[PDB]
From Swiss-Prot, chains A, B:
<feature type="binding site">
    <location>
        <position position="143"/>
    </location>
    <ligand>
        <name>D-glucose</name>
    </ligand>
</feature>
<comment type="similarity">
    <text>Belongs to the PQQ oxidoreductase GdhB family.</text>
</comment>
<keyword id="KW-0732">Signal</keyword>
<feature type="region of interest" description="PQQ">
    <location>
        <begin position="406"/>
        <end position="408"/>
    </location>
</feature>
<feature type="binding site">
    <location>
        <position position="168"/>
    </location>
    <ligand>
        <name>D-glucose</name>
    </ligand>
</feature>
<comment type="subunit">
    <text>Homodimer.</text>
</comment>
<feature type="binding site">
    <location>
        <position position="248"/>
    </location>
    <ligand>
        <name>Ca(2+) 1</name>
    </ligand>
</feature>
<dbReference type="GO" id="GO:0008876">
    <property type="term" value="F:quinoprotein glucose dehydrogenase activity"/>
</dbReference>
<feature type="region of interest" description="PQQ">
    <location>
        <begin position="228"/>
        <end position="229"/>
    </location>
</feature>
<dbReference type="Pfam" id="PF07995">
    <property type="entry name" value="GSDH"/>
</dbReference>
<dbReference type="InterPro" id="IPR012938">
    <property type="entry name" value="Glc/Sorbosone_DH"/>
</dbReference>
<feature type="binding site">
    <location>
        <position position="348"/>
    </location>
    <ligand>
        <name>pyrroloquinoline quinone</name>
    </ligand>
</feature>
<feature type="binding site">
    <location>
        <position position="309"/>
    </location>
    <ligand>
        <name>Ca(2+) 3</name>
    </ligand>
</feature>
<keyword id="KW-0106">Calcium</keyword>
<dbReference type="InterPro" id="IPR011042">
    <property type="entry name" value="6-blade_b-propeller_TolB-like"/>
</dbReference>
<feature type="binding site">
    <location>
        <position position="228"/>
    </location>
    <ligand>
        <name>D-glucose</name>
    </ligand>
</feature>
<keyword id="KW-0560">Oxidoreductase</keyword>
Length: 452, 452
């Protein structure tokens, strides 16, 4: 899709909803869920705390703090994945993923691992107990961790693990592994270094489903590959799997996740259109002092190999349902008319989640079969309509609730007339006039919007 | 997708198939079907003849000639739709559409109608009889008639009817009706002038299905709208509906047809990307002496209103699964790298059909879940892979059977190892070296390709 203008974002004020801050003292709140107890549960990414909030009264309890979570102030690591077993009454399990030190690591630049871990909920003492590591030794870094953890209708865990930031900034010269897959020998040694830029599908005990897809002749935990930073994952009522993902200077994506698909990163951003992006592989540059001009690969310094999207030899490439956004090769990623911080005008929205709106007896008119996608950089919640079979999007991403806030997650109440959102503690966001600010209106908050 | 180069088309020679020309100099052969008698049936658009061809010996019989078919030498009108009843053993019916004179027409420029008609096959006399008009008074013109007619798994007739060529060439100043839908009053009067640029869904007796979608508050024969020239339509084994469609200078489409969808034409060609196309509405131009610059709306003469794809206020817009092809705004539609005949280099392939390959006892290796799309302008047949649920394409359109022929239709034998193809009697096609020729290698032919 084509970017909205600052004016178009600023008008999305959602005057038909009442706003109320429920909690305002949260530290890097990350994931939000409607629990099986009809309470709101949420995570703090850096502290490792799991909180439960009474939606009616607003009282809150810290149910548990995951010990030894590792988090860097300049990083996106920490406590990430968070989901309830779907039959919680009879299987009182909570599944998380988190950053932990890796005692086997021989890399002082990458000292950590990601672990998918199960806890047992004790309703008598209201806490979590009996930790069990389902899948350990997964990649960890400060960048593009993703880490959405959901349980599908097949009662399998689906887990997004980002590309770790390879081929940008601090990891510029590391070779991106989004396209790479394990050998059988690597699986035998539990070497999961290729588990970057993937959606994983695991059994509830961490093992490999016997009907997972094959990649390059090997069936592993990988379900799909070729992802950059997929922070949104959500099943629809008819069992389809929708996803949101952050692109580089362009081409954030809404994807339909299908078994065995290849979503193209890093060779393809968004559509395979050769428009506004090309794959500049700095790991293949002979000179490691080469600079990244950060023009999305369209303009590069001498010495870095560049592959056009159409020059890639790919297999099972699946294009996105929608891009937020796609621009021409003539696009100027340095436009000075935007200000000193030109990145704010980049054709992206930085989606942070993806949530299937299920309606209810007070469902909001017109919102049937919508997907809600929070935007960090634009301070809106997008509403994206699909057809009733969730096979295609209809029309465009409609912005909602414009504010100077970094929206991190969103859910809705069972009746469907109240939305609950989390906001980041700090960072940059676009203002009504299109400029950048790091003064957030509601830092680290749980906010509700009630239809009136 | 990005256009293939002339060299990439030239190498797609399909050396793994044996070619045998069964017939040539057919009079504008148009549609072919594997018949209930395991013979090949095909139509001649210009004559109204329905021919049956013996696969083994190639003997041909003129089974029937549809009387009073109207065809213009320079036109795309004539005998069009052609399908067998799916339970032919117990329902020996053949369904057609055709151009016929309209006696109540009050326009000398548009004197004809399209009629969807049923015939009964009499096996004892080996001919057709007892015609029944199912739906008459449909639009008719020389351009963009489409006319693909299939019976769905719901035992409904699905019928594509093109936009009649409005807003180009001989119909430049007529207002395109692809976005328009009937009022209840027009329906009551059987005024079907808005049945342009649509997929129609009809009961077998021609009546309006009560479960057809609603458009602007009215349920009509319209199933989807916003199409230009959709010549390809085919159901998948799991009941989805795939489609191909010719765009203008760009953005031929492969579409997934979903009930009630709006496929954007003429406001949107291909994706809603503002890339290489804009909607110039010549019917709204200040005067009818203005010239069409034929630069796909990116540059137009003064006095014609232009609407960007992103400026359209649309409802239920459904984007294509694949475009053949999409180009940048700076693309040169009048490129001098080719000869005076710039159109042959336009980033299009002119898809003429769409056929779901179903395999069989001799299925071709690797062709699972593919869609075959013949190209008129490039002299190839494309193979397009989808995932096993027919929810997305995988990778790109792979060209096959490169020749100096305009491929018009394609089917496969039940065993799956033989393809049968129709070619046009006349027209332009691109040579190996990228230049145009109107010398066709196999004019008006039925061609058999057998996997080695
Ligand atoms: O403008 C853009 O394209 C853009 C903007 C941001 C932004 O939020 O400022 C991000 C981003 N996302 C996170 C996160 O925690 O998800 C952290 C950051 C960061 O830059 O620090 C990204 C990206 O990561 O691709 N792209
Ligand atoms: O280069 C292009 O884009 C292109 C090329 C052709 C071509 O075949 O020469 C056509 C076309 N298709 C038919 C048909 O019978 O299907 C007739 C014609 C015609 O121009 O006479 C179209 C189009 O109709 O959009 N576009
Ligand atoms: Ca980004
Ligand atoms: Ca992608
Ligand atoms: Ca792209
Ligand atoms: Ca065309
Ligand atoms: Ca379209
Ligand atoms: Ca377009």
């Amino acid at each position: 899709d084509v970017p909205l203008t600052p004016s178009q974002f600023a008008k999305a004020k959602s005057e038909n909803f009442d706003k109320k801050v429920i909690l305002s003292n949260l530290n890097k709140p990350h994931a939000l869920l409607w629990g099986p107890d009809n309470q709101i549960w949420l995570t703090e990414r850096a502290t490792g705390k799991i909180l439960r909030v009474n939606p009616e009264s607003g009282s809150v309890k810290t149910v548990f703090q995951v010990p030894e979570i590792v988090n860097d102030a300049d990083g996106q690591n920490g406590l990430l994945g968070f989901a309830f077993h779907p039959d919680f009454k009879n299987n009182p399990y909570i599944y998380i993923s988190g950053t932990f030190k890796n005692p086997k690591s021989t890399d002082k630049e990458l000292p950590n691992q990601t672990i998918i871990r199960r806890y047992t909920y004790n309703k008598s003492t209201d806490t979590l107990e009996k930790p069990v590591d389902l899948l350990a030794g997964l990649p960890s870094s400060k960048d593009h961790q993703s880490g959405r953890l959901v349980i599908g209708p097949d009662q399998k865990i689906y887990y997004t693990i980002g590309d770790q930031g390879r081929n940008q900034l601090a990891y510029l010269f590391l070779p991106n592994q989004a396209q790479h897959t394990p050998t059988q020998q690597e699986l035998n040694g539990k070497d999961y270094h290729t588990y970057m830029g993937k959606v994983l599908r695991l059994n509830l005990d961490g093992s490999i489903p016997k009907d997972n897809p094959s990649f390059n002749g090997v069936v592993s935990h990988i379900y799909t590959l070729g992802h950059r930073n997929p922070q949104g994952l959500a099943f629809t009522p008819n069992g389809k799997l929708l996803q949101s993902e952050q692109g580089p200077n362009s081409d954030d994506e809404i994807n339909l996740i299908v078994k065995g698909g290849n979503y193209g990163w890093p060779n393809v951003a968004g559509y395979k259109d050769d428009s506004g992006y090309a794959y500049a592989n700095y790991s293949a540059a002979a000179n490691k002092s080469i600079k990244d001009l950060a023009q999305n690969g369209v303009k590069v310094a001498a010495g870095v190999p560049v592959t056009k999207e159409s020059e890639w030899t790919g297999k099972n490439f699946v294009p996105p349902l929608k891009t937020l956004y796609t621009v021409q090769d003539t696009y100027n990623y340095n436009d000075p008319t935007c200000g000193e911080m030109t990145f704010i005008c980049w054709p992206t929205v930085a989606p942070s989640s993806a949530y299937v709106y299920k309606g209810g007896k007070k469902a909001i008119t017109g919102w049937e079969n919508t997907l809600l996608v929070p935007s960090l950089k634009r301070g809106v919640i997008f509403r994206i309509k699909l057809d009733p079979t969730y096979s295609t999007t209809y029309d465009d991403a409609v912005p909602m609730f414009k504010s100077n806030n970094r929206y991190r997650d969103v859910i809705a109440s069972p009746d469907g007339n109240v939305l609950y959102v989390l906001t980041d503690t700090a960072g940059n966001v676009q203002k009504d006039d299109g400029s950048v600010t790091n003064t957030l209106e509601n830092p680290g908050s749980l906010i509700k919007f009630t239809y009136k």
